[PDB]
Design a protein around this ligand. Structure first.
Ligand SMILES: OC[C@H]1O[C@@](CO)(O[C@H]2O[C@H](CO)[C@@H](O)[C@H](O)[C@H]2O)[C@@H](O)[C@@H]1O
Ligand code: MG
Length: 244
C-alpha cells in the first residue's frame, strides 16, 4: 500500500559513505510512511543489528539477512520462509563437498546458519575453482546456489534463497509490484536482486563481479549510478522517479 519497496545491501551500498548515509536517511526520513524498507544483507541478523548501532541505520520494515536465507519481520523470524528453504536442503552433504576443497576455508561459525554455508576463497587460489565447486554441488540432486562476491566470500544457499528470491517473496507478501521496487547492490551477492524484474541500481564503487554481470545481463531496468554508497540510492530514486 506504499509507493516504494526499497531493498538495499548494507556494506558498501547503504553503509560506507557516512555523509551519504546521513543525507539519504534524512531524505527518506521525511516520507518514511511512503515506502517499505528492507535491508538485504549478507550479514547475520545479529551482525546487521550491530552495524545499525555502529552507523545508525534507520529502522527497516524487514531484514533480509544472510543473503536472504533469514527474513525477519518485526515480530521475528519468518518461519514460513525457513520451512520453505528447508525443503530438499541437505546442508551436511553440501558442506562435506565444500570442505573438500583445499582452496576453501570455513568462515566463522557465526557466519553460518541452517541455510547458509560460507567459505573464504584463498587469495592465491584460481577463482575457476568456484565453477568446479558449483558444478560439483549442482550435480548432487540438491537445489543449491553458489554466491561468489568480492573475489573471496563464497556462500552456499538453497536454490530459492538469494537476495532476489527473498525480495520476490517480500514483494508478494506486501503486494508490491516490481515496478514499485528498487534494489541496490554492490557485489556478487546482490546479483540475485538484479535478476529480479525490480528496478535496480548498481553503486559506483561496485565489485567487479557485479560490474561484469551488468555488462552481460544489464537491462533497461538496471541503472549504473555515478554516485557511490548511499548516494547511489538517492540517484536511483531520482532516476526512476520514485517517491514523486
Ligand atoms: O559486503 C561484503 C562484506 O560483507 C561481509 C560482512 O561481514 O560479509 C557478509 O557477506 C558475505 C557475502 O554475502 C558473506 O559470505 C559473509 O558471511 C557475510 O558476513 C564481509 O565479510 C564482506 O567483505
Ligand atoms: Mg553486496
Amino acid at each position: 500500500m506504499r509507493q516504494l519497496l526499497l531493498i538495499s545491501d548494507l556494506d558498501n551500498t547503504w553503509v560506507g559513505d557516512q555523509q551519504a548515509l546521513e543525507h539519504l536517511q534524512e531524505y527518506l526520513g521525511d516520507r518514511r510512511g511512503n515506502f517499505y524498507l528492507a535491508y538485504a544483507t549478507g550479514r547475520s541478523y545479529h551482525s546487521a543489528r550491530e552495524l545499525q548501532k555502529q552507523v545508525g541505520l534507520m529502522e527497516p520494515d524487514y531484514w533480509l539477512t544472510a543473503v536472504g536465507s533469514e527474513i525477519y519481520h518485526p515480530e521475528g523470524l519468518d518461519q514460513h520462509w525457513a520451512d520453505y528453504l528447508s525443503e530438499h536442503w541437505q546442508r551436511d552433504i553440501l558442506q562435506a563437498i565444500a570442505d573438500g576443497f583445499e582452496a576453501l576455508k570455513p568462515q566463522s561459525p557465526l557466519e553460518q546458519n541452517p541455510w547458509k554455508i560460507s567459505y573464504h576463497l584463498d587469495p592465491q587460489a584460481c577463482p575457476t575453482v568456484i565453477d568446479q565447486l558449483t558444478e560439483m554441488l549442482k550435480e548432487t540432486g540438491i537445489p543449491v546456489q553458489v554466491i561468489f562476491s568480492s573475489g573471496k566470500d563464497v556462500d552456499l544457499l538453497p536454490q530459492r534463497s538469494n537476495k532476489g528470491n527473498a525480495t520476490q517473496y517480500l514483494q508478494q507478501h506486501l503486494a508490491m509490484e516490481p515496478s514499485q521496487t528498487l534494489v541496490c547492490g554492490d557485489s556478487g551477492n546482490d546479483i540475485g536482486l538484479f535478476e529480479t524484474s525490480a528496478r535496480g541500481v548498481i553503486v559506483r564503487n561496485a565489485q567487479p563481479e557485479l560490474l561484469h554481470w551488468y555488462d552481460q545481463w544489464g537491462d533497461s531496468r538496471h541503472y549504473r549510478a555515478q554516485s557511490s554508497h548511499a548516494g547511489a540510492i538517492l540517484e536511483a530514486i531520482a532516476h526512476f522517479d520514485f517517491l514523486s
